[PDB]
Amino acid sequence: HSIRVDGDIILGGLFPVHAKGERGVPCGELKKEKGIHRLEAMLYAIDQINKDPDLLSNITLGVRILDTCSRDTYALEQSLTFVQALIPDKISGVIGAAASSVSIMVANILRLFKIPQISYASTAPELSDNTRYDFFSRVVPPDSYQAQAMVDIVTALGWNYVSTLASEGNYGESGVEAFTQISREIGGVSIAQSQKIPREPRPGEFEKIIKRLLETPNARAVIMFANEDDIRRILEAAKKLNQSGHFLWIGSDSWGSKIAPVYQQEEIAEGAVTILPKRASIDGFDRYFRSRTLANNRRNVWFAEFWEENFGCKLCTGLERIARDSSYEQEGKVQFVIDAVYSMAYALHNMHKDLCPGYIGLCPRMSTIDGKELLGYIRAVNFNGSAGTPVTFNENGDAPGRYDIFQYQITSTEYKVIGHWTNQLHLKVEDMQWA
Ligand SMILES: N[C@H](C(=O)O)c1ccc(C(=O)O)c(C(=O)O)c1
Numbered sequence: 011h012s013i014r015v016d017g018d019i020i021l022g023g024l025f026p027v028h029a030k031g032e033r034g035v036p037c038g039e040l041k042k043e044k045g046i047h048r049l050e051a052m053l054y055a056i057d058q059i060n061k062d063p064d065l066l067s068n069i070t071l072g073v074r075i076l077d078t079c080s081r082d083t084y085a086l087e088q089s090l091t092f093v094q095a096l097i098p099d100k101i102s103g104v105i106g107a108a109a110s111s112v113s114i115m116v117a118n119i120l121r122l123f124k125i126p127q128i129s130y131a132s133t134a135p136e137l138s139d140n141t142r143y144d145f146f147s148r149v150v151p152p153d154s155y156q157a158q159a160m161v162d163i164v165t166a167l168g169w170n171y172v173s174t175l176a177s178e179g180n181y182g183e184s185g186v187e188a189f190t191q192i193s194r195e196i197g198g199v200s201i202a203q204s205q206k207i208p209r210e211p212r213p214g215e216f217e218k219i220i221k222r223l224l225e226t227p228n229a230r231a232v233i234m235f236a237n238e239d240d241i242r243r244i245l246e247a248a249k250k251l252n253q254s255g256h257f258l259w260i261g262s263d264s265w266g267s268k269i270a271p272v273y274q275q276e277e278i279a280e281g282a283v284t285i286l287p288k289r290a291s292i293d294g295f296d297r298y299f300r301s302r303t304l305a306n307n308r309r310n311v312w313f314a315e316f317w318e319e320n321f322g323c324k325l326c327t328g329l330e331r332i333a334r335d336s337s338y339e340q341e342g343k344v345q346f347v348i349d350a351v352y353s354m355a356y357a358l359h360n361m362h363k364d365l366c367p368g369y370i371g372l373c374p375r376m377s378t379i380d381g382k383e384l385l386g387y388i389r390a391v392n393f394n395g396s397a398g399t400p401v402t403f404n405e406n407g408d409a410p411g412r413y414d415i416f417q418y419q420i421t422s423t424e425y426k427v428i429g430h431w432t433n434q435l436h437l438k439v440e441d442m443q444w445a
Pocket residue numbers: 026044108109110111131132133134181237238263264265
């Protein structure tokens with residue numbers, strides 16, 4: 011009940027195609043953008059490597075994409091499919107997953123069987139530790155650099171007294187913890203209160219959060235690592251308690267430039283500073299995804315379920331066009347998905363150069379690929395990918411801290427590029443606006 015493509019070297023995939031089900035059920039509603047767009051971006055990238063004669067000459071890359079269902083427990087059970095070769099598909103490297111807690115549980119099982127793992131979205135500072143998850147790499151920067159950026163933004167505005175808000179899980183708690191560590195040890199940034207939002211919150215919890223935050227009234231700036239559904243509800247609760255203009259929101263990559271938490275809540279979201287990793291839209295994937303029909307894209311097992319959710323269809327004509335019959339935007343992490351697959355491909359190409367010299371196709375010396383060796387190749391990889399931007403890794407397996415800084419402004423509503431963070435803060439304070 012998943013995507014299989016035969017090939018010489020088979021690469022594993024982990025994507026949240028469905029959201030986590032309510033109470034009992036494992037899998038719920040289909041994630042159209044966070045699931046299908048990223049899944050199809052891996053299939054686009056793999057097809058491009060097979061098309062390219064220079065990268066892996068007469069060597070084809072295989073696909074084994076599995077659904078994580080937004081939860082770590084389901085992804086762990088799916089992860090065992092990669093290791094079922096040892097008492098049949100042999101998996102060299104796994105691309106995924108999205109969520110940090112999901113990627114942590116996968117990293118713990120893949121390290122023992124010596125399988126390298128490259129993520130496209132997981133940003134938790136815990137994953138950069140080479141003791142706990144030594145086979146983990148990522149094409150997205152760790153939250154150590156985002157928390158440093160947040161400290162830099164706060165200090166540049168003269169905001170010595172702040173409060174923090176976290177969502178339950180690894181991404182929310184450790185992201186705030188990374189901010190706390192930079193604040194406590196270095197400089198003079200004081201934390202008033204660190205409030206936590208539960209995973210399954212009660213109907214009256216978000217109103218209690220605002221009331222608790224108001225107990226330290228001078229702490230106006232709120233640094234937050236909350237999910238899309240959480241931010242929506244905090245700002246909804248803040249608007250209800252007549253707290254317009256009081257709170258100065260600071261959001262992470264989970265907030266980014268999403269219109270979802272700010273919609274019909276434009277007044278309360280005014281002047282909110284957000285940080286997001288440096289990113290561009292790919293027209294190549296856009297041309298690929300728009301030309302996807304139910305006839306040609308039969309290899310995607312979830313594409314039939316996608317067609318119903320996208321147009322309001324029910325299996326309806328079954329001859330619709332994307333970006334013509336329904337509103338279409340390319341997902342953010344798509345650049346990082348393509349750059350993750352190419353990072354794996356370039357490392358395999360570099361391993362082929364060393365182990366099979368003057369050879370076309372796989373040599374008998376590469377019949378069983380060593381994961382401990384291949385991991386070192388991934389870290390050493392340096393190339394221009396997708397956007398034309400360089401893709402690189404350090405010793406710990408992290409991408410460099412390259413960020414965009416946005417502010418939500420009313421003039422017309424937009425996320426205006428007020429600055430950027432690349433090792434050091436470059437922030438244009440002149441372009442900022444408040445209520
Ligand atoms: N950086 C966190 C993390 O570490 O999980 C993260 C991961 C994945 C997603 C996503 O699936 O889109 C988001 C998000 O909602 O922006 C945030």
